[PDB]
């Protein structure tokens, strides 16, 4: 048996609104990764991450399974 | 602050001990404890937590008195004064796995792994965070963020890296009834084992409340009658005004 | 009358307020505890208690 | 008063004590980290000082390491420079305990301790 | 006459609850001041039986708090009755400064009993945060830490006071054991300023919601407004038990369950919930010797407002005006108690400035300007030239 | 005891009101007439009349103020945004 | 240790009887335990442990 979250977490990122934020958080990270091999980026002190579009992501599908979980699990 | 100086929100889950009438799941607390003994007992003193105080609530009290006679603690030395050790009784303490803060953080790599007696009331979020702390590590931080080497991320503590790396995986320990144990059942286990163990009172606190918010919203109905009933005199008083006759 | 009889000896008004807050104390406790562990019939000890049956 | 020796601090172990219910946050430097901390000029910090004033015995680092913002705790041997990094405003420092950078507008305190042979009286 | 009014001991209490002619047209407000004197009992009963079980070293506070809310029986009850009831207490006092500051309460010939107001106001305050810090959490050393290295600004004299009030180097042992001894005295510096509060408030009575003169229709205290108390006894009763046993933790700060560590700092030291707007006053001066004096001054500033107000009508009942600018003072105290929970951060930096600059603009700037210009439009409103 | 000073209130006989004179009050036993004779019809129609009146002096407070602390609170979280990084090292500094 | 300089020993003559006892240090690194000389602000030892 799988765990109960994991699925559910899954369900949920391939919804129209989540695949709509998945791939926007996927287009900050490939702007990340030709950031990080461009020369002069160790001393830049300027680093953009992708945190807040991270937080995007984790926050829509917090609103999702909250309420929904607790029913799956004994 | 940032919002990953902040942490991310714990969002609300739907807890079996939430709500003004309903107590803890005692058959949680019990599949609790098994996941802090077999998990995180290695690494987390429950320093605040009586033997005896486990009696009643998740285990029968022959389960105690074999659970606690595994430790050693400290007796009353003997006839010539050499220290001596015993086994436990109901009326002592879970002991932590580390004997001084200083051991402690020799073993986490520096950091100092908190005691769990008060984690709940602790922590801003409750339960919620103590939940969606354990089931928040991802497999990998977000793109652009370089960890301290050592530490590990996951959002839902406040600034990223946490020194804890995940130990909840799916069928690390074995239930005593046949419940699957995943990591969400686990870690929604000993979150309400931890909660247990942060408010014992929860049960008679939620009954007590409920004979006085009974009793205390009947008294003040009825005051308002008794009040209404000695006030009807002055409540109802009529004044008439005949100016007199101003001969005087 | 049942002024003349409850009412209207104060030496009887508070010997019945007394035996009426007697007698709420043990029943009004009771009818609250078999209502709140009713309402969480599953989740108490002794429903753990019995439901370790091996 | 604390009266920890004159032959027991590491150089590569960054000690932190509590002394008089406060963190003091000790190293022991090599002769080549004399230069190596006040190389930075003056102009490229937000106060002027150099290694004299603050440390008498330059070998002998003493530092006072109560931040000038909060109060938060460096690390030892972490940073940019091989000194102290404030995880708690990103407060970088050298192994002068200068603020070079970070938002904290002033350099760490300098307790008064006193050396008489075979001891440092940190009071 | 009467045994009430023939002996020494009953003519005080027959003078006081029983004979004593209230106004009879007071509203629901003149109830505050008999919730505090039962909200006083409340804390000193449970702080009596909770200091029974109380060690006040700095290694047994926390650890004896929580042996109060494990080991004694309905030690739960005792440690949330008192913390969220000391709550409660700021809350009914804060309604019953405004109560008195609305209905012109504060002036002639009751000047009296404004000024034995901010001196139970001012030890009530020195009471809750010397009891605070007696849990010995994180937020109450690091607030003690915080709130005693303030006389540290006082010229010359203010390391030597400090190390004098800490009683050593830092908030340590002493500071500890000796700010429970000295909380476990100033209620009962408090329930003797009470009685110093009723007897200026005894010379002339109270006052009315209308701010005419209520010697005319006066009703008497007992079976009146003995029985108007007790709804609101028994509803203060009713609101403190729920969140004493439904919701216990909402009101207090989650990181005062931390024992308090003084090598890690918090992420952002707050008081408790009713000192935030002084805190905020506090941290709005970028000074420090000038905070100290600001913070204390606007509680000293409570003194000017019989001198201010140029009003021939007591109260703001009848004035249009003076009853809108009253609320943008209570909902500019509340805003306040926001900035002081807020970090110091673009912009609550100038909200924080801004919005006590209202709470000084309204005793010293609005009430003498406002209140003129209400008594030329009372004036030239009615008299035809 | 000694003589006190000359206050605005007395006791019962000498109030200290002015003198009145044709005033009759009458009033009624509260054991020969209903109480909560009108607890509704007060907390429908008497109720609304005085929330009428005294509302635009709650409001307008809370409408300037809470208006206020919104349009702060909402840039504050720009400023501490990826968005508005560009603009705090201006007002920061 | 400290109450018998200037009553009856000197400054030097308490550093050097203090110094011959041992008390418990905080532990180190590792968190075993471990035993420092006295100084003038510990209490004058007794013979038996217990
Ligand atoms: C150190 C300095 C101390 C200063 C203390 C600062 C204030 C502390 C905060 C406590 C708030 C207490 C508010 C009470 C206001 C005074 C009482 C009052 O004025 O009520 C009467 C008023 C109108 O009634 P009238 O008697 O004037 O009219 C009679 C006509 N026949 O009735 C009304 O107009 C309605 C009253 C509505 C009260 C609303 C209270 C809001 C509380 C803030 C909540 C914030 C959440 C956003
Ligand atoms: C069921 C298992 C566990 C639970 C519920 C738990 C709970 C917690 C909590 C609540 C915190 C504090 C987080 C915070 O302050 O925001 C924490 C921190 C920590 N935990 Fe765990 N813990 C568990 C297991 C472990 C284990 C097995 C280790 C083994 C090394 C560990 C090591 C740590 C450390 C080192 C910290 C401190 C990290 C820091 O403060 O930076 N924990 N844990
Ligand atoms: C005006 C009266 C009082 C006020 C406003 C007051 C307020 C407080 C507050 C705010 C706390 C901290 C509560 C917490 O954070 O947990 C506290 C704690 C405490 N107070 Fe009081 N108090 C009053 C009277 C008293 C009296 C008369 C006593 C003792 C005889 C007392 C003894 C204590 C004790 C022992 C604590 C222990 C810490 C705790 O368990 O909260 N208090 N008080
Ligand atoms: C432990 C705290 C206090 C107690 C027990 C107390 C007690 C009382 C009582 C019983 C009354 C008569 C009932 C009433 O008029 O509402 C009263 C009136 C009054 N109190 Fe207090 N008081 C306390 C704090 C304060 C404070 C902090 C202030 C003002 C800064 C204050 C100012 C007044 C005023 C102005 C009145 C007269 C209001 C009027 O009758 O027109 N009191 N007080
Ligand atoms: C103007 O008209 C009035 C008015 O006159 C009055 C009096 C009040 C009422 C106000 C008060 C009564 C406030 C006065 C308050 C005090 C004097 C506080 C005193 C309270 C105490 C609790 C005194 C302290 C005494 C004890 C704690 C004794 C209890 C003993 C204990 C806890 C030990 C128990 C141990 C054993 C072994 C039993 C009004 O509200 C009012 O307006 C209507
Ligand atoms: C001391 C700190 C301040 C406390 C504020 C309390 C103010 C109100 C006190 C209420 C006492 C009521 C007695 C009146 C009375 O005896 O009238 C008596 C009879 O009244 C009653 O029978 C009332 C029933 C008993 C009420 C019990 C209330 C107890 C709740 C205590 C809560 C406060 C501690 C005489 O009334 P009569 O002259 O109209 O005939
Ligand atoms: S502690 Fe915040 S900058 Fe040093």
Redesign the interface.
Known sequence: ??????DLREHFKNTEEGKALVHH?EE??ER??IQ?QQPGYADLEH?????????HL??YL??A???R?????? | MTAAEHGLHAPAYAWSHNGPFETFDHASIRRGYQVYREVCAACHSLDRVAWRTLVGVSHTNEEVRNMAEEFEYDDEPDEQGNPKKRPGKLSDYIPGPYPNEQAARAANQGALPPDLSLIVKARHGGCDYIFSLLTGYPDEPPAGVALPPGSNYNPYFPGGSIAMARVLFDDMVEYEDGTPATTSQMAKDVTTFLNWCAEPEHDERKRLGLKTVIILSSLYLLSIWVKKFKWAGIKTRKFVFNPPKPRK | SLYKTFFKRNAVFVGTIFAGAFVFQTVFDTAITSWYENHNKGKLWKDVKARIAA | KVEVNLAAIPLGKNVVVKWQGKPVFIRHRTPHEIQEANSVDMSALKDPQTDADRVKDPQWLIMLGICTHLGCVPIGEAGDFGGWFCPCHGSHYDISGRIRKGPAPLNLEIPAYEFDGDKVIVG | MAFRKSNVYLSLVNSYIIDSPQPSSINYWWNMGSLLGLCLVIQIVTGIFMAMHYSSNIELAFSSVEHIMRDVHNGYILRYLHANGASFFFMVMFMHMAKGLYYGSYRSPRVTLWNVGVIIFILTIATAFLGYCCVYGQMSHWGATVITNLFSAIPFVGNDIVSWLWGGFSVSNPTIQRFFALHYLVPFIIAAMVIMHLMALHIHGSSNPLGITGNLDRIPMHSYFIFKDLVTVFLFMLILALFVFYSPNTLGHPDNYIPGNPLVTPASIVPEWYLLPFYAILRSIPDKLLGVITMFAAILVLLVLPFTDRSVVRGNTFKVLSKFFFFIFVFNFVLLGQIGACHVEVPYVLMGQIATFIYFAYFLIIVPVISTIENVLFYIGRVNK | GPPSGKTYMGWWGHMGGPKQKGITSYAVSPYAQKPLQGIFHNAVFNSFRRFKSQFLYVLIPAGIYWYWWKNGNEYNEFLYSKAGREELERVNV
């Open positions: 048996v799988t765990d109960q979250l994991e958080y900050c990270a990340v990764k990080q680093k953009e991450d992708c945190v807040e579009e991270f937080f984790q926050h917090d609103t399974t909250a309420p979980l607790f029913d799956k699990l004994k």
